[PDB]
């Protein structure tokens, strides 16, 4: 029961988007293995999601967590990057699909980074790369990152589910020498894709 709205490039919405994700992209030290060797993005689309079902399910929790944190929602926008992407913008988010593996506990990640999330599209570590060259850092095929709203709450600061009387878990891991934050929730509800960008990663020559 979803349905997507183009954003013009010329648009204050799209653009804020697209610098968001332009800014937030680091140098990774794993010489880009993960989610390829970039500076900037090739931003194609960014497609706004609306569904009222999967929006009242959002803000409905939002308001639970606001009540147990001293009316403090503690919303950030941050990034999140899967094979799922096409999955959750109609389903939603669902924990029943999370990363059990993950390092803190089987959730669902995201990231201040914008480059960071760009790591998971193909895969966990990038996986084998894209489906049809088989690179993890490939310029031609098109990528896909969600841009979601997601209710943090009362965050636990470490290094399942969520630690007693909190609601999300806020990290630093420093991968390769490098320490960037992540943001785990554990119920599906505390988020909503709210924005779809299509994009892919410029050759930095
Ligand atoms: C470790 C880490 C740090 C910083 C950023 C990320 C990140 O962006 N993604 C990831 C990948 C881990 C992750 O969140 N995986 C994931 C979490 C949730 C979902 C998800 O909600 N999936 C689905 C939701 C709804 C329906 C689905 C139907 C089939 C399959 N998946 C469905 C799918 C994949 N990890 C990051
Ligand atoms: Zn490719």
């Not at 931003?43 to 939002?62: A, F, G, P, S």
């Not at 031609?140 to 009387?165: D, E, M, N, W």
């Not at 992540?182 to 779809?196: D, K, M, S, T, W």
Request: with cysteine; glycine share 10%.
């Amino acid at each position: 029961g979803t349905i997507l709205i183009d954003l013009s490039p010329d648009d204050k919405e799209f653009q804020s988007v697209e610098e968001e994700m332009q800014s937030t992209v680091r140098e990774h030290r794993d010489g880009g293995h993960a989610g390829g060797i970039f500076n900037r993005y090739n931003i194609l689309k960014i497609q706004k999601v609306c569904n009222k079902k999967l929006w009242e399910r959002y803000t409905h929790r939002r308001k639970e967590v606001s009540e147990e944190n001293h009316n403090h929602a503690n919303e950030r926008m941050l990034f999140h990057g899967s094979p799922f992407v096409n999955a959750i913008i109609h389903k939603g988010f669902d924990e029943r699909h999370a990363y059990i593996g993950g390092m803190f506990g089987a959730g669902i990640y995201f990231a201040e980074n914008s480059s960071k999330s760009n790591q998971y599209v193909y895969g966990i570590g990038g996986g084998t790369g894209c489906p049809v060259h088989k690179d993890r850092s490939c310029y031609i095929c098109h990528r896909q990152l969600l841009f979601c709203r997601v209710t943090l709450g009362k965050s636990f600061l470490q290094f399942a589910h969520s630690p007693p009387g909190h609601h999300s878990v806020t990290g630093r891991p420093s991968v390769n020498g490098l320490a960037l934050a992540e943001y785990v929730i554990y119920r599906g509800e505390q988020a909503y894709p709210e924005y779809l960008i299509t994009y892919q990663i410029m050759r930095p020559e």
